[PDB]
């Protein structure tokens, strides 16, 4: 997958010269230079989570997943999400399924504060054997307000916001590991396996925008595919983290042979979003974020570069 | 398909209020209000043309189709295309196929003058049984420079630019009509059937941008899905057209039972793009456009509203 994909990436980077000294030149998401502001643009699909949706005929939350994966990446550079367009490829245009998908699309756009301004629907029964949903979102951020990670310095404090559902990359691993052994109808800690796998991810637009406007913010990380590795990419300095105790479906996955080291490189492990603020702003940040979702101190940026030290687990990434 | 799709469209329009009195409010493509300019955004996929690409193992032009369908819609409102992101869903990550797709993506971005700034690739063999390519493009247009069609008035002259390949909607009809009877290897007028069906559509960015900057332009129509109906949507006035003679694969399709009336509602019939200019600017416009592709006078806007009169065919749409 990686070898083949690099042909697309390498061709794309060669097109950057076509906007050199032109409006919208490119500089989580791509930033386009519109002189008065950066336009941030990102693309993402739900992945194989729509397979579980199809098995239980529940599509009213998969649109939240698609919007969340897009808008949570936009806000990482400090951009305010503005609009989204979706790509829906289907085997057959089922009226009830489309009505279900539309419900989650509306609810997701509401929480993200965005308009769904267009898209395309492709009925291709010889090309699609089920349902495929993806989307592109655009946001705006002032030039002197981009959150890059350069301001991150040792002694900065890392704050985590609790997560909801599972992302597509980790969901692929959970499906092969848990479904053949337990079945979708297996009840684990009050929730059936398909409910654990179908549960929509969380939209963090509203608390993060309020945080940026009220608190000095140095770093913003969407804990999606890659787990804690999304935190390494922000800064060259290292981290000293005390992750929350393993719980929920992550506990069942860990009990089924996935090592802790790989748990934190694939799953969110209870933290869907991370923010980095100066030491003094801890109480200010925690008070704001907790008005929306449960937020807690995770650790700090340390001088020892690169490595993340998960203290209560003894893990180094 | 239409009944189910309206659930998505109706939900999307209900999200417009989420940007009311906010930056990027929405107002061929959607126009977002960024106060200093409109951001135009559009989405489109190649459709079933990638099925022919898979049959002959030729993918080095399908990326041109995807870019063309996006950027040709952007320029219809007068927007300069700026960037594109693509969505690639595949059964298997074939290294040679990805390298082929990348070649057409580069060439298409070059002709369109855009950067490919991102995207997502989804290897989902249980969801995709082949290859699926789509994309979203963004452009910029000043507020007082949008080409809406309101300036179109009777006696304005319609100019056509010659087309290249077939669009996805008409390609679906051609596939079922011609492949079982003739086979992909059937040679028709110097080109095999798969070559007629796989031939990439034309990118019109460069001539249309030059036209807008040098000539007074009242209307711009991308002749895609819908044929001449894309011209009706520009203005309430009617048209008096002399379309070019039927030729190429369109002639073979017409010989196989599709009536002329439906030919002009589905296929481009030799004109991929149309422009509407004041009567006086005919020679000015034709001289500019012909530096790029073959361009010719088609007719004029008339007082008798709505109806298009194809004079050399006796067709009314
Ligand atoms: N899946 C979708 N979500 C939102 N809008 C759509 C979708 N598919 C089509 N549209 C809109 O439908 C209109 C024309 O549909 P079509 O040209 O058939 O794709 C345009 O305004 C599109 O943006
Ligand atoms: N099909 C694609 N075309 C262009 N860029 C892509 C594509 N897929 C992934 N990328 C880029 O690859 C980087 C990360 O890949 P991933 O997070 O695995 O999607 C981002 O810069 C994406 O924009
Ligand atoms: Cl997400
Ligand atoms: Cl996850
Ligand atoms: Cl096109
Ligand atoms: Cl066509
Ligand atoms: Zn530059
Ligand atoms: Zn993804
Ligand atoms: Zn993402
Ligand atoms: Zn019905
Ligand atoms: Zn400022
Ligand atoms: Zn600071
Ligand atoms: Zn997430
Ligand atoms: Zn102080
Ligand atoms: Zn303070
Ligand atoms: Zn206090
Ligand atoms: Zn308004
Ligand atoms: Zn289409
Ligand atoms: Zn189009
Ligand atoms: Zn190889
Ligand atoms: Zn002006
Ligand atoms: Zn004028
Ligand atoms: Zn076209
Ligand atoms: Zn004059
Ligand atoms: Zn003149
Ligand atoms: Zn002359």
From Swiss-Prot, chains A, B:
It catalyses: 2-formamido-N(1)-(5-O-phospho-beta-D-ribosyl)acetamidine + ATP = 5-amino-1-(5-phospho-beta-D-ribosyl)imidazole + ADP + phosphate + H(+). The keyword Cytoplasm applies. It is found in: Cytoplasm. It comes from the Archaea. One of its GO terms (biological process) is 'de novo' IMP biosynthetic process. One of its GO terms (cellular component) is cytosol. Its main location: cytoplasm. PANTHER family: TRIFUNCTIONAL PURINE BIOSYNTHETIC PROTEIN ADENOSINE-3, TRIFUNCTIONAL PURINE BIOSYNTHETIC PROTEIN ADENOSINE-3-RELATED. This is Phosphoribosylformylglycinamidine cyclo-ligase. It comes from Pyrococcus horikoshii (strain ATCC 700860 / DSM 12428 / JCM 9974 / NBRC 100139 / OT-3). The gene is purM.
């Amino acid at each position: 997958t990686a070898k083949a994909l690099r042909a697309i990436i390498d061709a794309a980077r060669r097109t950057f010269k076509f906007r050199m000294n032109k409006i919208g030149e490119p500089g989580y998401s791509a930033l386009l230079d519109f002189k008065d502001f950066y336009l941030a643009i990102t693309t993402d699909g739900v992945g194989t989570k729509i397979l579980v949706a199809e098995a239980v005929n529940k599509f009213d939350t998969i649109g939240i997943d698609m919007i969340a994966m897009n808008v949570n990446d936009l806000i990482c550079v400090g951009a305010e999400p503005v609009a989204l367009v979706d790509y829906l490829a289907v085997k057959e245009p089922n009226e009830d399924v489309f009505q279900q998908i539309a419900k989650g699309l509306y609810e997701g756009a509401k929480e993200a504060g965005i308009a769904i301004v267009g898209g395309e629907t492709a009925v291709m029964p010889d090309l699609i054997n089920g349902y495929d949903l993806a989307g592109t979102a655009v946001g705006i951020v002032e030039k002197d307000k981009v959150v890059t990670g350069e301001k991150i310095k040792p002694d900065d404090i890392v704050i985590g916001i609790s997560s909801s559902g599972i992302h597509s990359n980790g969901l692929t691993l959970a499906r092969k590991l848990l479904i053949p052994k337990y079945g979708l109808d297996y009840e684990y800690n009050g929730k059936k396996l398909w409910e654990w796998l179908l549960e929509p991810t969380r939209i963090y637009v509203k608390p993060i925008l309020k945080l940026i406007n009220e608190v000095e913010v140095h770093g913003l990380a969407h804990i999606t595919g890659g787990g804690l590795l999304n935190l390494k990419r922000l800064t060259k300095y290292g981290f000293e983290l005390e992750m929350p105790p393993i719980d929920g479906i992550f506990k069942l996955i860990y009990e089924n042979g996935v090592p802790l080291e790989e748990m934190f490189r694939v799953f969110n492990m209870g933290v869907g979003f991370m923010v980095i603020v100066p030491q003094e702003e801890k109480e200010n940040a925690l008070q704001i974020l907790n008005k929306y979702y449960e937020s807690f101190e995770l650790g700090k940026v340390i001088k020892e570069p690169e490595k993340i030290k998960v203290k209560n687990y003894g893990i180094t990434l």
